[PDB]
Amino acid sequence: KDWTQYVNPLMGSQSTFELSTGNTYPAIARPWGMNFWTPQTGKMGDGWQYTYTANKIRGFKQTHQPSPWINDYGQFSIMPIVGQPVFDEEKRASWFAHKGEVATPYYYKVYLAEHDIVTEMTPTERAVLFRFTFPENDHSYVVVDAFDKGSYIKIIPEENKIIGYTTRNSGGVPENFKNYFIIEFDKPFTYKATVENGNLQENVAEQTTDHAGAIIGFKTRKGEQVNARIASSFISFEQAAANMNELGKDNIEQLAQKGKDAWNQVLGKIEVEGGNLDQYRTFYSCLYRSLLFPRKFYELDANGQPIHYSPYNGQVLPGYMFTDTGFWDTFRCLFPLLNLMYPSVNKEMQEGLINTYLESGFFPEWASPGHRGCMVGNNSASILVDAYMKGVKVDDIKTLYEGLIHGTENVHPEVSSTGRLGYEYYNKLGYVPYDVKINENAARTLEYAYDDWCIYRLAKELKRPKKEISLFAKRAMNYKNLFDKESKLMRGRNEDGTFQSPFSPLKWGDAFTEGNSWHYTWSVFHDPQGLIDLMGGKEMFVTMMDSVFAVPPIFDDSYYGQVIHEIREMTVMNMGNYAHGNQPIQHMIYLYDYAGQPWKAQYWLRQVMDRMYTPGPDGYCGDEDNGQTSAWYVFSALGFYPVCPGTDEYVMGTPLFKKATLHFENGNSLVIDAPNNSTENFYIDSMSFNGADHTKNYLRHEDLFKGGTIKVDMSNRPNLNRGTKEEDMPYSFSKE
């Protein structure tokens, strides 16, 4: 029963600065692996470390990068060569072609045309095995590149061993940051040299310098194979040596099988059938991408118990730790997918978040590996509360709540996206003003209002004092403070209470983040009825929604000074101002359900699924973003979506396959049966749940978990009478 066959690690690699089709690299890794491995086509330092259109590989690199924008840390590479012992990253490079390359989650192989070498690699969570097949040559070499900005290398010939550390990073690390690595060869060195800032030094054992490296050599027969066992650690060499045991004594074939098994274990929790090969590939590739971030950032001590280097305070402490995710992205549906299908994994992650707070003073928003300045909002609140409300409960609930309250009245002194920038204005006025030097003020307000509803939900659940509950119940309505009755849109508001003038609904950034008013107005996840009312009723609301799709993709880009890829991605799509390639508008289509018109959602969701996702190297319509854009497709292909994390609800869309089966960790299974599904039959004519007629526009977490069968009768005509009743509507705070 194999699903890995459908996973294309190359999907999203054909991307540029100007137009993203994913901005991914081939992550050769275990699910949520501490260390990822990738072929490297880019130069050292370039966020675009692998691009499909590149012709040369120059190394096989350990990487932790979550995006080309955030860039990398804990990074070093290995490169087999023939002829001269050359360290230079250009001179050592080799031409290759994609037809000479095999990429899967558990195994990567490539043929290096300028050296006549085959490279294979199979990783575990923290370690990896390389196998190099060399040609007949007197002078065959392996290059180890510890990268620049301060590193260390040491050759240990009595053990066919090279060790070292790397420090090049992109911010967000303590002063003592190091990644310690160990490499063991099965073949003795006949040549050895370390490299000091590009200068080759034969029989010198050790370097401590800006850019350290090593070159070892030997004679090879035709087809002779040399294996290299590699592990790394954020704690020490001794711990890197312990991590190495993950490999046991396995060879390439045995480790590949183990990795294939670990991926089939997780991918196979969702079985789809009755689709075409494009759909299978697109689905499972998206699922693979949803099971990578945040990465494990903990290691195992001698008793098999988790310990971690703190990317927050630089100490080595007990317990879980994860990193490399921006909650601004992944609150939306990535983490919800974990709460539905992988709750035991999120349990580890949530414990890790308690540790971020204890070690740093704040919950993270963007972490890579420590706090990084990027995006907006206080959406850790959604993550933390959603997990708790769906039965993923940390040990220390006391600290959990305190951490949440802390975030509402503090901003990190060095990292402005950590905590709530503008909390003082927000707490006092009910919004962050447009004219007080706090950029992206309207986006901050709207997301905080939602984050406060999340806190309200937990405070109520925890039976906090009525005063606290009331405060957050009030703050949750702060989205009303930026609604402009005249345009029916959200609008920047001045400190004096006047609306910002002149108002451009089509202007990106400024008051908003990477979007305009037409994208951000819909950010009222917890109260769509409230928004419906603000607009003057469901008919007007639907009119506003339809117009998003109907207009040209005209924009105003003056806040950025250039057509950023996010805007360009939107212009080429021919779907009006529906900017699906970015996060803010991603839940929007599901809002049709709340207005009593689910057939419109069914239509537009099928459009997006068919057109905006392809399984090739240019498969996405914009940045993939650590699982968010991928997990969107996974949920939407299943036929539902967590519009409002922190509720128990999944809002109905339209399924893509004829059959889908979910295998929950509790041992129950759900069958979603849509036997008449096709390219033409994308409307839901009727639905039943275990025999009972089901006309509601939503499904509940605990009902899903019980198991059984959902039957969906597909049709090529919209049913105008189903899901229009009040009791069919999903949750709105205003009705509560």
Ligand X SMILES: OC[C@@H]1[C@@H](O)[C@H](O)[C@H](O)c2nccn21
Interacting residue ranges for ligand X, rule: CB under 6 A: 67, 69-70, 326, 328-329, 374-375, 514, 582-583, 623, 625
CB 382: neighbour CB atoms within 10 A? Answer: 27
Residues 6+ apart with CB under 8 A from 368: 64, 66, 70, 73, 170, 171, 172, 323, 324
Which of ligand X, Ca ion, none interacts with 69 (beta carbon under 5 to 8 A by kind)?
ligand X
582 is in an annotated binding site: yes
Residue 624: C-alpha distances to residues 20, 21, 22, 71, 358 (Å) = 9, 8, 5, 15, 30
Site for Ca ion in 173-232 (CB under 5 A): none
365 is in an annotated binding site: no
Closest approach, Cβ 251 to ligand X, in A, equals: 37
Which of ligand X, Ca ion, none interacts with 94 (beta carbon under 5 to 8 A by kind)?
none
583 is in an annotated binding site: yes
Residue whose CB is less far from Ca ion, 346 or 629:
629
Which of Ca ion, ligand X, none interacts with 233 (beta carbon under 5 to 8 A by kind)?
none
Q: Which stretch binds Ca ion (CB under 5 A): 16-24, 330-338, 540-548, 621-629?
A: 621-629
Residue whose CB is less far from Ca ion, 357 or 578:
578
The residues with which 712 forms a beta bridge, in sequence order, are 687
Site for Ca ion in 581-610 (CB under 5 A): 582
Residue whose CB is less far from ligand X, 326 or 645:
326
CA atoms within 13 A on the CB side of 56: 12
Site for Ca ion in 631-690 (CB under 5 A): none
Closest approach, Cβ 345 to ligand X, in A, equals: 21
CB 361: neighbour CB atoms within 10 A? Answer: 17
Closest approach, Cβ 17 to ligand X, in A, equals: 11
8 is in an annotated binding site: no
Whole-number Å distance between alpha carbons of 605 and 582: 16
Closest approach, Cβ 623 to Ca ion, in A, equals: 4
Q: Which stretch binds Ca ion (CB under 5 A): 65-73, 364-372, 409-417, 574-582?
A: 574-582
Residue whose CB is less far from ligand X, 329 or 440:
329
Residue 363 sits at the vertex; the CA angle it makes with 358 and 366, to the nearest 5 degrees, is 130
Residue whose CB is less far from ligand X, 329 or 484:
329
CB 97: neighbour CB atoms within 10 A? Answer: 10
246 is in an annotated binding site: no
Which of ligand X, Ca ion, none interacts with 324 (beta carbon under 5 to 8 A by kind)?
none
Whole-number Å distance between alpha carbons of 524 and 508: 19
Closest approach, Cβ 628 to ligand X, in A, equals: 7
Q: Report the residue closest to Ca ion, judged by CB.
A: 623
- Token reading at 67: 């995006």
**Residue 239, amino acid:** Q
Which of Ca ion, ligand X, none interacts with 629 (beta carbon under 5 to 8 A by kind)?
none
> Which residue of 348, 569, 618, 623 would you call a contact of Ca ion, by CB under 5 A?
623
Site for Ca ion in 349-378 (CB under 5 A): none
CB-based contacts of 311-315 (< 8 A; 24+ apart in sequence): 311/172, 311/173, 311/174, 311/177, 311/234, 311/367, 311/369, 311/370, 312/174, 312/356, 312/359, 312/360, 312/370, 312/371, 313/174, 313/359, 313/360, 314/174, 314/175, 314/176, 314/177, 315/359
Whole-number Å distance between alpha carbons of 189 and 217: 6
Tell me the H-state helices in 409-527.
423-429, 441-461, 466-475, 517-520
> Which residue of 72, 386, 625, 728 would you call a contact of Ca ion, by CB under 5 A?
625
Q: How many residues bind Ca ion (CB under 5 A)?
A: 3
198 is in an annotated binding site: no
Closest approach, Cβ 344 to ligand X, in A, equals: 26
Closest approach, Cβ 290 to ligand X, in A, equals: 15
The residues with which 51 forms a beta bridge, in sequence order, are none
Residue whose CB is less far from ligand X, 207 or 577:
577
Residue whose CB is less far from ligand X, 133 or 439:
439
Asked if 149 and 171 touch (Cβ cutoff 8 Å), the reply is no
Residue whose CB is less far from ligand X, 196 or 365:
365
Angle between helix axes 466-475 and 441-461 (nearest 10 degrees) is 150
E strands in 65-221: 76-82, 94-95, 101-104, 107-112, 117-123, 127-134, 137-145, 151-156, 161-166, 179-185, 191-196, 199-202, 206-209, 212-220
Residue whose CB is less far from Ca ion, 170 or 220:
170
Residue whose CB is less far from ligand X, 582 or 647:
582
CB 465: neighbour CB atoms within 10 A? Answer: 9
| 260 sits in which H/E element | helix 252-267
Whole-number Å distance between alpha carbons of 218 and 195: 18
Closest approach, Cβ 612 to Ca ion, in A, equals: 14
Pairing between strand 683-689 and 489-490?
unpaired
Whole-number Å distance between alpha carbons of 146 and 142: 13
Asked if 569 is part of the footprint of Ca ion (rule: CB under 5 A), the reply reads: no
Q: Which stretch binds Ca ion (CB under 5 A): 203-211, 491-499, 521-529, 577-585?
A: 577-585
Three-state SS for 728? helix
Q: Which stretch binds Ca ion (CB under 5 A): 235-243, 361-369, 625-633, 637-645?
A: 625-633
Residue whose CB is less far from ligand X, 145 or 365:
365
Closest approach, Cβ 372 to ligand X, in A, equals: 9
Contact footprint for Ca ion (CB under 5 A): 582, 623, 625
Q: Which residues are annotated as a binding site?
A: 329, 514, 581-583, 625
Q: Which residues are annotated as a binding site for Ca(2+)?
A: 329, 514, 581-583, 625
